[PDB]
Design a protein around this ligand. Structure first.
Ligand SMILES: [Mg+2]
Ligand SMILES: [Mg+2]
Lengths: 201, 200
């Protein structure tokens, strides 16, 4: 399952420096639109569950639904117990963004699982945000850099998935220190920052 | 005065992106947020008031006022247009609580108080637009990917005082190289208020 290293980049300038350092390894940019959903009685959030639709797409526009349950973040290491994703038809996705109540009528795996584990729900939309993700790959290295465009300001993050998030943590941190990229440990998911309506301090 | 072509879909936008990649000089992730009075004072005069936030090293922000924009056969003309850069933190405060626009002192707002009186500002929402800028000598070209909640729109923009002459060569260029397009029929803000993508 998932376990990643997750660092907040201090500001725009640190983010640009980091972008420039790694430019040679850039392989993709994703313009991600995330929209989040819950039941009318906070069925999902009271059980530490996040339900969202992601639209992304270079050549072909794509859409998937993701359910993530019980995500812990300590000292920059983030782990999730449950994570399930299924691809979703984009036009249906847009229809559900316009009117989340339609989520009750669409047939798909995640949504029955959701009816089974939680009630039949009255679905509500919680809004969404754009995240710009740059993907760096060289040999056996994924590195992801995020610029999240909240209405209330921009957040920047590094994400590197490893099952050894502690050996990797030392090297990554000293890479960043040595090269003048100011950072700290992320204290909150992108969704929690969004729900705060403010950038963390 | 500018040329404004709608690119047919993402794949056309992709072909164009790679066609022109060598001339790429900039990407702006623009957040546009729109404002009016409580009585649609501005929109009833064909008047648009917005804040744009954009990136790089420095977070940047400007206020823009556009009055009386006509769109004919892919040609855009704006009758008046004024821009002044705006403090980004104040901008975010006004996005969060648009009524605070009544207290900030700046040219566009003083001008606006003079044509319309004291007004109670409301937010009309906003959207993210990704602008790629291509520059080669005296050629400036902008390609837009607008990320509305209800879908993506793709657009070309060419600033020019000779829209007829530029129109012939640009269209022939796009056809020759397989980029499907048509003439934009609506502003980004008009599409946004429609809550729907134009007829494709
Ligand atoms: Mg932002
Ligand atoms: Mg879109």
């Amino acid at each position: 399952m998932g376990t990643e290293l997750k660092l907040r980049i201090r500001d725009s300038t640190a983010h640009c420096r980091l972008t420039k350092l790694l430019s040679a390894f850039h392989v993709e940019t994703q313009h991600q639109e995330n929209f989040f959903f819950d039941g009318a009685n906070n069925e999902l959030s009271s059980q530490q569950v996040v339900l969202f639709l992601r639209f992304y797409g270079d050549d072909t526009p794509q859409c998937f639904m993701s359910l993530k349950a019980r995500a812990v973040l300590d000292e920059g290491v983030y782990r999730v117990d449950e994570e399930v994703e299924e691809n979703f038809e984009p036009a249906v996705g847009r229809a559900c963004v316009a009117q989340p109540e339609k989520l009750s009528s669409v047939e798909c795996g995640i949504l029955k699982m959701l009816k089974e584990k939680f009630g039949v729900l009255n679905f509500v939309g919680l809004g969404g945000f754009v995240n710009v993700r740059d993907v760096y790959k060289w040999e056996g290295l994924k590195l992801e850099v995020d610029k999240t465009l909240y209405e209330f300001g921009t957040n920047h993050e590094i994400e590197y998935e490893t099952s050894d998030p502690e050996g990797v943590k030392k090297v990554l941190e000293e890479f960043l220190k040595e090269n003048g990229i100011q950072y700290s440990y992320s204290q909150a998911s992108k969704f929690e920052v969004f729900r705060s309506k403010k950038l963390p301090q």
